[PDB]
A paper describes a structure:
NarK is highly expressed during anaerobic growth in the presence of nitrate, and plays a central role in nitrate uptake, while NarU has important functions during severe nutrient starvation or slow growth. In this work, we demonstrate that NarK is a nitrate/nitrite antiporter, using an in vitro reconstituted system. The overall structures of NarK in both the occluded and inward-open states adopt a canonical MFS-fold with 12 TM helices, with TM1–TM6 and TM7–TM12 forming the N and C bundles, respectively. The substrate-binding site is located at the interface between the N and C bundles, in the middle of the TM segment.
Residue numbers in the entry: 11 to 242, 252 to 457
Write the structure that this text describes.
C-alpha cells in the first residue's frame, strides 16, 4: 500500500472492487482541492489589480488589465508541457511539486503590494508566475484519466475539472473578505487606511492561500499515488480547440477582467462584493453542459449556446454609459451573468465532446481492432491527456485576449465597445463555423 503502485490492473474486475476503486477515489479527492487552489492562484490578479490603486499604486487602466491577462499567457504555454509531466514524475510527485511551487508567487505578491515603489515589471513577473497555476489543469486532468481508465469511469474527469474551475469563484469570494481583516500581522502584514476609514490588507488576498497550498502539498505527498505503469484526427483537435477557446476561454477571460471592466464603467460600485457570482454559476453550469451535450448531441448544444453568447454579448451594449450618460449596472451585471452561464455551459459541453472523441472513441476503436482491455484503457488515457493538454492550451488564450482587448479598447477609444464588437463578431463566426461542421 506504498506511495508507488506497481500492481495496477484496472482490466481486472476483482482488482477494482478490492483495491482499484479505493485508490482512485483517494487520489481524486486530493486532486480536486489541489486543482481548486490552482485556479485561486491563477486568477489572483482579477481581484488584486482592482485594489492596487486603493493602496497607493498608480498604474494605468491598461496596465491593470494586462496584469489580469498575462497569467493566461504563461498558463497556455505551459499546459502542453504539463500534460507530459505526470507520466514522467508520477501523479503524486508532480501534484505535490506543481502545488508547492505556487507558494512562491503568493508570498512574493504579498510583499509587492505593500511597497508602492514596487516596479510594474515586478508585477509582470509575479503575474507570469501565477500562470504556472493555470497549467496545473493539464497535469491534474492527465493524472485522473489514468486513475479512472475504464469506460464507465467517464465523469471523474468532469468532476475534477468542474470542481477545479470553482477555485476562481472561491478566490474572488475569499479575497475581498480577508483584506478587510488583520490576520497576518505576525508575518509582517501592513494595513493601508482607506478613505472609508477602514483598513485594507492587500497582502492577505495572496497570503491566505499559502497555508492551504502547504497543507494539500503535504496531503498530496502522503495521500496520493504514483502509477508505475506504461503510458504509451488532428482535424477534430482544431475544432475542439476553437470550441474550447470560444467557451472556456470566454469563461476564464471574463473571470479575469470583469471586475476591472465594471470598475471603469461603474466606479461607485464595489464590484468585488458580487464579482465572484459570475465564475460561480459558470463553473456550476459546466457540469450541466456535459450531461446536456450527451443527451441532445454536441452539435445542437454548441449551436444554441453560441447563439445565446452572440445575443447576450449584443445586449451588453445597452447596459453601458454612452458616454457618462445613463447605463445600468444591474443590467450590466445580469447580462454578464448570462455570459458567464453560457460560457460555462459550452465549456462543459465542449469538454464532453473531447472525451467522446479522444477517450471513448479511442478505447472502442482498439477493441474493434481486437486489442486487449488493458491496451484500450492505456491509449485512450494517453490520447486524452495529450489532446486535452493541447486543447486547454489553445483555450487559455481567451484568458489573455478578453482582458487585453478591454484595456486596449478603453485606452484607444475611451470605451469598451471596441472590444465588445470583436467579441460579437467572434461569437457570430462561431455560430457559422459550427454550422459548417454539420
Ligand atoms: C518531489 C518532486 C518530484 C518532481 C520534481 C519535478 C521537477 C522537474 C521540474 C522541471 C524540469 C522538467 C523537465 C522535463 C523535461 C522533459 C523533456 C522530455 O520529456 O523529453
Ligand atoms: C515553500 C517554498 C516552496 C516549496 C516548493 C516545494 C517544491 C516541491 C517539491 C516536493 C514537494 C513535496 C515535498 C515533500 C512534502 C514534505 C514531506 C515531508 O514532510 O516528509 C516526508 C517524509 O519525511 C518522507 O516520507
Ligand atoms: C480565511 C480562509 C477562508 C477559506 C479559505 C478556503 C480555502 C479553500 C481550500 C480548498 C477547498 C477544498
Ligand atoms: C519541456 C517542459 C518545460 C517545462 C518544465 C515543467 C515546468 C517548469 C516547472 C517549474 C520550474 C521552476
Ligand atoms: C514552454 C514555455 C514556458 C513559459 C514560461 C513562462 C514563465 C515566465 C516567467 C517570467 C520570466 C520573466 C519575464 C520577463 C518580464 C519582462 C518585464 C518587462 O518587460 O516589463
Ligand atoms: C488582444 C489585444 C487587441 C484587442 C483588439 C480589440 C481592439 C478594440 C478596438 C480598437 C479600436 C481602434 C480605434
Amino acid at each position: 500500500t506504498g506511495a508507488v503502485i506497481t500492481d495496477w490492473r484496472p482490466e481486472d474486475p476483482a482488482f477494482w472492487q478490492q483495491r482499484g476503486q479505493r485508490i482512485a477515489s483517494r487520489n481524486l479527492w486530493i486532486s480536486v482541492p489541489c486543482l481548486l487552489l490552482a485556479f485561486c492562484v491563477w486568477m489572483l490578479f482579477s481581484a488584486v489589480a482592482v485594489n492596487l490603486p486603493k493602496v497607493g499604486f498608480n498604474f494605468t487602466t491598461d496596465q491593470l488589465f494586462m496584469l489580469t491577462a498575462l497569467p493566461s499567457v504563461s498558463g497556455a504555454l505551459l499546459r502542453v508541457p504539463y500534460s507530459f509531466m505526470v507520466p514522467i514524475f508520477g501523479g503524486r510527485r508532480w501534484t505535490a511539486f506543481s502545488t508547492g511551487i505556487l507558494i512562491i508567487p503568493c508570498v512574493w505578491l504579498g510583499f509587492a503590494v505593500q511597497d508602492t515603489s514596487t516596479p510594474y515589471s515586478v508585477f509582470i513577473i509575479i503575474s507570469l508566475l501565477c500562470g504556472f497555476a493555470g497549467a496545473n489543469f493539464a497535469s491534474s486532468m492527465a493524472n485522473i484519466s489514468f486513475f479512472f481508465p475504464k469506460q464507465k469511469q467517464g465523469g471523474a474527469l468532469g468532476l475534477n475539472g468542474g470542481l477545479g474551475n470553482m477555485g476562481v469563484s472561491v478566490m474572488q469570494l475569499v479575497a475581498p473578505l480577508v483584506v478587510s481583516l488583520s490576520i497576518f500581522a505576525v508575518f509582517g502584514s501592513q494595513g493601508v487606511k482607506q478613505p472609508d476609514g477602514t483598513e485594507l490588507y492587500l497582502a492577505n488576498a495572496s497570503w491566505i492561500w499559502v497555508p492551504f497550498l502547504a497543507i494539500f502539498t503535504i496531503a498530496a505527498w502522503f495521500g496520493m499515488n504514483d502509477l508505475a505503469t506504461s503510458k504509451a484526427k488532428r482535424g477534430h483537435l482544431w475544432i475542439m480547440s476553437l470550441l474550447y477557446l470560444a467557451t472556456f476561454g470566454s469563461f476564464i477571460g471574463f473571470s479575469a477582467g470583469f471586475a476591472m471592466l465594471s470598475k471603469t464603467q461603474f466606479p461607485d460600485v464595489q464590484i468585488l462584493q458580487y464579482a465572484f457570482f459570475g465564475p460561480f454559476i459558470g463553473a456550476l453550469a459546466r457540469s450541466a453542459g456535459g450531461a446536456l451535450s450527451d443527451r441532445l448531441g454536441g452539435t445542437r448544444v454548441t449551436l444554441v449556446n453560441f447563439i445565446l453568447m452572440a445575443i447576450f454579448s449584443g445586449l451588453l451594449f445597452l447596459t453601458l454609459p454612452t458616454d457618462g450618460q445613463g447605463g445600468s449596472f444591474m443590467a450590466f451585471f445580469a447580462v454578464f451573468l448570462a455570459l458567464f452561464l453560457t460560457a460555462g455551459l459550452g465549456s462543459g459541453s465542449t469538454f464532453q465532446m473531447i472525451s467522446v472523441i479522444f477517450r471513448k472513441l479511442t478505447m472502442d476503436r482498439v477493441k474493434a481492432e481486437g486489442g486487449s482491455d488493458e491496451r484500450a484503457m492505456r491509449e485512450a488515457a494517453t490520447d486524452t491527456a495529450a489532446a486535452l493538454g493541447f486543447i486547454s492550451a489553445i483555450g487559455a488564450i481567451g484568458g489573455f485576449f478578453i482582458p487585453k482587448a478591454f484595456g486596449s479598447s478603453l485606452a484607444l477609444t475611451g470605451s469598451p465597445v471596441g472590444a465588445m464588437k470583436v467579441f460579437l463578431i467572434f461569437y457570430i463566426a462561431c455560430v457559422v463555423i459550427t454550422w459548417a461542421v454539420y
